[model samples]
Target: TNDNYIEEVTAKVLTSGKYSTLYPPTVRRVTERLFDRYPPKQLEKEVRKKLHQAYGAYIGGIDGKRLEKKIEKIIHEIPNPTTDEATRTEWEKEICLKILNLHTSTNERTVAYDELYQKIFEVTGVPTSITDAGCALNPFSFPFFTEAGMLGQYIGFDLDKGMIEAIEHSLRTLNAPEGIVVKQGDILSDPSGESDLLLMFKLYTLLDRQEEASGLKILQEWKYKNAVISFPIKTNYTVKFENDLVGSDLRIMQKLKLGNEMYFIVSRL
Candidate 1:
């Protein structure tokens, strides 16, 4: 009876769109591995989690009602940005801490970003101010800048006027001793200033999908000593897809082979 129920659920899930063609074989592998560890139940949910794992995220899965309550708990648990002028820096730091705990933050995609950050540091051997293009909520994830004393010069740009205003307010009103700047700008249509590093996170994919070769051109035209660009990676059968789930290219990752080598890579060209 249990086996029949699981088969029925699997069939229904397999029929679903947006990753409908996932490899049944791999799903079996993931489910078996997870089920053994998690034990005796929730087979449908565990299967979906495994399916998503292929796309780079690492969070566990649960049903609708269960998932809602879990998120609600996290909503209350995460601290809001500080309104106190004196504690603003601490508030910023806590936001960074919270970013570390984000469900999507634990994924390989995000991990690779931290890797790229540290790798750039080892090569350049110094902290560099950031220019986060299309910075939606990414400002919260950037503790490296504040820690390195570069947040004072850190600048982020986005086309979302409302989001820009929100970030600007958070940075300004919070009394960040080492001031930060966020501006509203369209990367393609608007002119952009130079920075030590140009972060085109999940943006390139969106750009390329819309405009073709312009994405690479924009990446090359940017002013920066070491540009660390990233892109989303996905598996076939619709099992895994970028869909804004990742960033940076793996090809560049290979030749760079970690730290200072990455610097040499750009220098050689």
Candidate 2:
């Protein structure tokens, strides 16, 4: 009976247009969790509600296949590495901008991407590698860092399987330099490996929802030389995280705002 019920729930959840792309395991886990929290009659209602809160909210309504097709078309047009450096830079920037527009989170940071990196680099001194949790279409913006001569590794983790597949396909087509990858994983449960920098852009609040103070625990324990954590500055969303960072061993090296988001640079080592 339990197996049949789970199968029925997972099937219905996967049928939603926007949520169909979510990693299957994440959907199942959330459904299973909800099963424990609600009665059979209430299960369906709770599943939809919690599903949106946990994954759908961040999905931002992207069609993964469409995104992949656009990225492939644009990236394929990039001139060969032997071509004029200026020409290649222009093409790369264009492609990067096109990809950034594919997601709500990255689109909001589009105009400030360069300045955001500049401010962080000013403190961290051009990190050689980066790990971004809850990364949604953010890895495709690697050219912004590559242009600054930091051709290092970038690994992004998210719970969207379709997005991950699209990101991987685009990078492969671009012949993206080594170490740029996207993996399907829930950062709330998975271990974030070491890197020169950890990006938690608009991620702390979501992490807090998953577990009490889990967001702060991540910043406190993640192995990184430098980190840039950010939150929305102007939005209808009520995000109250400033006080959470209070009295933590980590120090906020700088606070910078761009667009509607504020960034906090931290260095623990």
Candidate 3:
């Protein structure tokens, strides 16, 4: 209780920190593509609120120094230039373990280790490339792909330039850069390159938040043979759209679970 109370108070004062750091170059590009259609100040206002919340959360859990220390603890496990896939996988998982230990958000960390891809693998089999939409640091979970074998590419896209750079840096630091790539893209206007498998985990709702039509157009127009799309269980729109998904080309192959979230593997039938 004391820690929570301390965290809440810390977040209150850190409001100022949220301001200067919130709309940094990385975050500024975010709304331009996703929420830019929203009215001017309204967009900034909500973005500011969420950034404040995330900052409070970060301050609540652990500082950057503490996190760096955790990484340093398992630093030896990092994949080196000479490591093989099996060895590199073990190293990636170990470092990801350290990530789960210190992260403020448990979902991303659990997702880093979760068997989500495995469930999709049951149907899709071994795939060569993946285009991860709205990907956060979850790309750090590259070990999951080890079982799938060496991919031609594991590309990730997000609105935050800083985060794109951050994920890229982590991949390099972890020595798992063989097939990983991260880039900043505006989903509304940017081109999502083709991949054998497309991953849109927990991304649709936000576009729904922006506008239902915005999310729908992408779902219909996306270019992929197999896609694993997911959202929180509470997202009713996804449930409603399930019936509408049964088309000649885009059809639902499986509905599965990952903790509090639900996902559908939409395939080109």
State the lDDT of candidate 2 residue by residue for 149-206, as single tens digits. 5678888888877778899988887778778878887766565567788899888888
Better of 1 and 3 by lDDT: 3
Badly placed stretches (over 4 Å) of model 2 are: 1-20, 24-48, 75-82, 210-212, 235-239
Clashes of each: 4, 0, 0
lDDT of each: 0.49, 0.76, 0.60
Among all windows of 10 consecutive residues in model 1, the one with the lowest summed lDDT is 259-268
lDDT of 3 by residue, 148-178 (tens): 5635688877654544555565567677767
The residue-level lDDT of candidate 2 at 213 comes to 73
Which window of 10 residues has the lowest lDDT sum in candidate 3? 20-29
C-alpha displacement of 172 in model 3, angstroms?
1.1
Model 3 lDDT on a 0 to 1 scale: 0.60
RMSD values for the candidates in order, in angstroms, are 14.6, 3.7, 9.2
Worst 10 residues of 2 by lDDT: 235-244
TM-score for candidate 1: 0.50
